């Protein structure tokens, strides 16, 4: 059985900066009751309970790199951090995903893709940012109206960000919603978006 050291399953998968992050081939997952290394940025994890039951009986887990952070020539991929996600007194973010911002006051549409060229199933994660108001939307992504289109051979979804006056959690009033699909071998996930996109950097080759 795996013993997560004061981290939630989501915080470890997305790579929480405060979470240390192990030896694979476990028989059960064991997390804290109220782990301090939560989702540093406020939000939710879609189908979170179904992902936990799917990882209880595993045989191999290895963090591969599906998309390098240096592979972002058309967007800003380093200014994406928040006070709610600290590391050594400095603002950070989840290590396994990339918060993309606009570069030179422009944000073109993304159409990058990736095929699973591995003999094992591939678990990939991604998220959407829900800004505070219209002014924050233009300040981060310029484009007022935006969307996210994630598509696999067995998945098709279109995410639209929402805007509302929310209370502060861990400091910020913004929110982030995280999703996950399984990528069987010889299949490709297709991403199309024009803002509010939390792109993946590392994935997980799993085997049950």
């Amino acid at each position, epitope marked *: 059985p795996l013993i997560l050291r004061d981290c939630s399953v989501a915080g470890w998968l997305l790579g929480n900066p405060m979470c240390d992050e192990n030896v694979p081939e476990w028989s059960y997952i064991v997390e804290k009751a109220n782990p301090v290394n939560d989702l540093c940025y406020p939000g939710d994890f879609n189908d979170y309970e179904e992902l936990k039951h799917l990882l209880s009986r595993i045989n191999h887990f290895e963090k591969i790199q599906i998309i390098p952070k240096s592979s972002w020539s058309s967007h800003e991929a380093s200014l994406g951090v928040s006070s709610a996600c600290p590391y050594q007194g400095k603002s950070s973010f989840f290590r396994n995903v990339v918060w993309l911002i606009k570069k030179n006051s422009t944000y073109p549409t993304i159409k990058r893709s990736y095929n699973n060229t591995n003999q094992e199933d591939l678990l990939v994660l991604w998220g959407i940012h829900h800004p505070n108001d219209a002014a924050e939307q233009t300040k981060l992504y310029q484009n007022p109206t935006t969307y996210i289109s994630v598509g696999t051979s067995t998945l098709n979804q279109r995410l639209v960000p929402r805007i509302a*006056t929310r209370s*502060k959690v861990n400091g910020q009033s913004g929110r982030m919603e995280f999703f996950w699909t399984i990528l069987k071998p010889n299949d490709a996930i297709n991403f199309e978006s024009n803002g509010n996109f939390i792109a993946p950097e590392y994935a997980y080759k799993i085997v049950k």
Partner: antibody
Amino acid sequence: VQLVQSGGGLVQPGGSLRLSCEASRFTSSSYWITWVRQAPGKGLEWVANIKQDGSEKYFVDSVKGRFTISRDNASNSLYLQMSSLRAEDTAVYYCARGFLERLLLGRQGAYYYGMDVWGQGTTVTVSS
Amino acid sequence: DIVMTQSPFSLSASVGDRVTMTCRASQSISSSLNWYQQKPGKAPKLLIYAASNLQSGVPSRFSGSGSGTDFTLTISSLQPEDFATYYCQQSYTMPPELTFGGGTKVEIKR
């Protein structure tokens, strides 16, 4: 953004009374308005939750059947129709707006709702 | 039905001292617990959101903690303007209902 109550006052036992929670600005929407009353000296007790458009509504047990929500579609007004009022309803009625959301703060998610903008309160007195 | 309980009923403390009050739920409400402050003759003000998150315009001396069924609100340095009744409120059962606690009265010793 401010909230203002309207429609309180004196009413006979078994009478009726309309309460309105008028917002002072344009709505981003998908908020709820919550009615909280407070009898003289006692504490806060929940009365009702109403989606700002009026699709969903929920009431506390003490007022079920007696309290309803009505709309005057000639205007843009959402009413809290208090009917069959009795002495246990004499209180100050506050309305507040809160944002309902699902958050992950632990092992599993749950609903979170904080009333962050409140009205000034309106007094309802049930007497002959 | 979730029943919220607060302790103590009232307390008297000098200016500068630390005040501690607790809130309990009859069943686990995760972290969906909020603290409100009601000064005399005024409407409640939201202080803590989701058990432990300060809101804007609230002094840092107000601190919240807790999880499950056990929750604590703390004032690190009591000030005269803090004279109020403090209520915990549970939103784990939203939308069909939410419930308040009995409230703790904070009095000043001078």
